[PDB]
């Protein structure tokens, strides 16, 4: 299992454990965290986070393009971790 450090823009930090075949958002919600989402299918931006450290599998998503993925943007509803990682939450409105 992997340690996912979730950091919010308001300064909260929580570490959520998540398996390599488990979605980041699902894991966070199990842990009781209040995370944004809408379609839960990788086709919008509502659940967006930014991967600051570590590695995530974004293969199931469809909304972000290749350059956005490279910058670290990640739709957490269908993202799965590939390492311990640090992810900034609540990022929809910062998507560029
Ligand atoms: S909630 Fe729509 S892409 Fe994640
Ligand atoms: Zn810390
Ligand atoms: Zn669960
Ligand atoms: Zn929105
Ligand atoms: Zn580190
Ligand atoms: Zn682009």
From TrEMBL:
Belongs to the 2Fe2S plant-type ferredoxin family. Its cofactor is [2Fe-2S] cluster. Zn(2+) 4 binds at residue 53. The keyword Iron-sulfur applies. [2Fe-2S] cluster binds at residues 38-40, 42, 44, 47, 77. The keyword Translocase does not apply. Zn(2+) 1 binds at residue 13. One of its GO terms (biological process) is electron transport chain. InterPro entries: 2Fe-2S_ferredoxin-like_sf (IPR036010), 2Fe-2S_ferredoxin-type (IPR001041), 2Fe2S_fd_BS (IPR006058), Beta-grasp_dom_sf (IPR012675), Fd_pln (IPR010241). It comes from the Viruses. It holds the Pfam family Fer2. Zn(2+) 2 binds at residue 19. One of its GO terms (molecular function) is metal ion binding. Keywords: 2Fe-2S, Electron transport, Iron, Iron-sulfur, Metal-binding, Transport, Zinc. Residues 2-93 form the 2Fe-2S ferredoxin-type domain. PROSITE patterns: 2FE2S_FER_1, 2FE2S_FER_2. It comes from Prochlorococcus phage P-SSM2. This is Ferredoxin.
């Amino acid at each position: 299992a992997y340690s996912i450090t979730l950091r919010s823009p308001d300064g909260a930090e929580e570490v959520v454990q998540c398996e390599e075949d488990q979605y980041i958002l699902e894991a966070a919600e199990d842990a009781g965290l209040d995370m944004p989402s809408s379609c839960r299918a990788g086709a919008c931006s509502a659940c967006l986070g930014k991967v600051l450290e570590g590695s995530v599998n974004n293969e199931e998503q469809s909304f972000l393009d290749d350059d956005q993925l490279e910058e670290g943007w990640s739709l957490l509803c269908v993202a799965m971790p590939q390492s311990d990682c640090v992810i900034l939450t609540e990022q929809e409105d910062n998507l560029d």
